[model samples]
Target chain A: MIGVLLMKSRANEEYGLRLGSQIFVKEMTRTGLATKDGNLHEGDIILKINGTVTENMSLTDARKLIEKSRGKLQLVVLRDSLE
Target chain B: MIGVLLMKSRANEEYGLRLGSQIFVKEMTRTGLATKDGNLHEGDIILKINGTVTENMSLTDARKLIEKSRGKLQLVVLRDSLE
Candidate 1:
């Protein structure tokens, strides 16, 4: 099942979650926002943010959304273990 | 890829979307809420409701969530057409 995560922006420049060719999570900065949130994993696929379904948005747009977010960043992530 | 849809509750006892054994959209009531929303289709698997991931939820719980919901119900649905 996909899970929801709320990561507060650190006022720093990084979100800590990296996106790959799949537009899914590619990596996590050990000290990044995503890493700090602790729920995100490398293999997880991002589904939505704030209410925007990220799958249709380009990878660049996905990054923009995360960086542009101001407060509690809501994310939806998919992990098949729920299946 | 999966997509999202929002439908306002009709205050009726129906949601207009029927779930099969897969807990996916199996049918749309021609005059039902899902059909009125116009984005949902048969075979589209529901991924979430509001912020709740419907995948891990029991089918009974899924129905309960829908029934208990008031106002606009936001839903995430999977459609391979986005692929």
Candidate 2:
């Protein structure tokens, strides 16, 4: 698992995120911040934000953290795999 | 995903649950609550508790909810699959 710090401008209001029990990369919008960086994947599970452990955070809470971060954000994620 | 209501006695602290990005039925103890029920699986993604959505809930928060429930827990879950 690798930690991919995804970033975006506050003006965009879009990180192209779609979440379930865990976070899924879902879709990366064209011209979007995360899309340009192109580091995350469709089934990656987000583990933390800005150094805060998100292992127990609810989806709503996690989204709020990202949206509230405004622009600069750090993310720790676990890759989906058998290993 | 199926809603499985798992029940256990306070005497037993084990629901035989193991979680990561999402909850996994790591092991169903021979006589554990969830094991006897036989409704959950090794890779089911828990989606809700009672009526609360767990899609964004951290593992800690989710566990607390279950522990606090004190024996009876209503869970909504998603099965792991390509579909």
Candidate 3:
């Protein structure tokens, strides 16, 4: 997947990217910025957050990136073919 | 005083601006982005947000501006002389 997403942040709210191992979006909120942007998908695996490579990156660091983004978010994801 | 600020957004967190009528920053958080950015002051009155003028704007609309900012925030404020 070559999805590049630019999203905004709201006060005291969640972007709603439910993830599992390999950092695939498990569940997304309909009102969430990720889903609202219409750029990301549930099956898409996060490859890069902002500019940080997610390859072997820790979950904590990834979360930190998302948390510390300061409103302007850049996400890159990989969407592979399904069986 | 004329103040201009650019701030980032963190998920599930507040920008820490306690506002009053005429839209002034009543109380701000040190951990919050506004305080950490060190651009906005408690006494400063918001004049514009993300280019939206605050002149005669409703309180709810002001809050909505901040909430709908989508992470990348722009603020212009007026700081008058203290009594």
For model 2, the stretches where C-alpha displacement exceeds 4 angstroms are A1-30, A58-60, A81-83, B1-30, B36-38, B41-43, B48-77, B80-83
Q: How much is B80 displaced in model 3, in angstroms?
A: 9.0
lDDT of 2 by residue, A1-83 (tens): 11112223234223222222455444444544554454454445556665666554555665555555543556566544334
Residue B63 lDDT (model 2): 57
DockQ of each: 0.02, 0.04, 0.04
lDDT of 1 by residue, A1-78 (tens): 322222323243222211112244545445444554444555455567657764424555666655555444556656
Residue B51, candidate 3: how far off, in angstroms? Answer: 0.8
Question: Which TM-score value belongs to model 1?
Answer: 0.34
Q: Tell me the TM-score of each prediction against the true structure.
A: 0.34, 0.43, 0.35
In model 3, pairs of residues that clash are A1-A79, A8-B70, A9-B70, A9-B71, A70-B8, A70-B9, A71-B9, A71-B71
On TM-score, the candidate that comes out on top is 2
lDDT of 3 at A27: 53
Ranking, lDDT, top scorer first:
3, 2, 1
Clashing pairs in 1: none
- lDDT tens per residue, model 2, B1-83: 11112233234233222123454333433444454454455445555665565543466665566545553456655644332
Q: Would you list the rank order by TM-score, best first?
A: 2, 3, 1
Worst 10 residues of 2 chain B by lDDT: B1-10
* Candidate 3 lDDT tens digits, B1-83: 11112233355652222111234454554455565454455544456656776443555665676656666666665545332
